[PDB]
Amino acid sequence: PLPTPVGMEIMPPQPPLPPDSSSQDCDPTASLRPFATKAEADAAVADIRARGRLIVGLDIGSNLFSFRDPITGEITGFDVDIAGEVARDIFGVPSHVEYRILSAAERVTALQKSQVDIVVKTMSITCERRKLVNFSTVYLDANQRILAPRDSPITKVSDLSGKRVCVARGTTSLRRIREIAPPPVIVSVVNWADCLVALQQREIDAVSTDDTILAGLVEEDPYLHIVGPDMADQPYGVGINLDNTGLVRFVNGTLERIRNDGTWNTLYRKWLTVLGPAPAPPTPRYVD
Ligand SMILES: N[C@@H](CCC(=O)O)C(=O)O
Asked: Which residues of this UniProt protein bind L-glutamate (predicted)?
């Protein structure tokens, strides 16, 4: 008897939402400059260092980003390795991490409640989210696209109308699909692996989310392919409690380091060559 994604919901039919120009960009990707001195940086993470490990929110439902490797049994992926570089800067080695398993829908609340130090879970930086949490500079820039079986006629956004499209709850992906007119039948799940299972069992017709995540689903199921135009920019940031500006500055120093010392390029080649040759790392933007 076939696996079933626990938590699969067919959403109530709703009229399309307009594309949001009201609060579109508050310049959301601009973040806080790193500390100039090593001593300042070490002081900003003294509490984490005293706790003995960095507590990182993510889940294991995003192949290539955060997932459990079936051979080693370890949580691994690009987001796991990004978080490990923060831990390296705090402790000297990347090993000192504890994961709190959080769905996409739980990222903001976990940060608000100080249940994790950081979220590294493909977290798009948006103006709406910046009212509630803080973010590092951009560490990867993705774009929303469409994933369908190779024999599917779906190749453009308008083809999704009336068809069953899967998104994880609590994502920008859902908001963007809610703009499509006429609407698709919107099926929501806990995580992106659940969308893959639904498609493999022909319970949906397509998945739409970050092309990075979709490429991870293609790696698991090469019967699928990515189609369609860029539907919405997705600049990933490390999510941080709104008031912990010192940790924002610290993480932004880590990102400056890995953009410039080759680590970012190494991590891209390690995980993301399905997307093509490594681009330059995203250029950071600073408010101050
Ligand atoms: N990156 C988008 C969609 C993918 C995801 O994070 O689950 C978001 O922050 O919601």
From this structure: 107, 122, 124, 129, 172, 192, 210
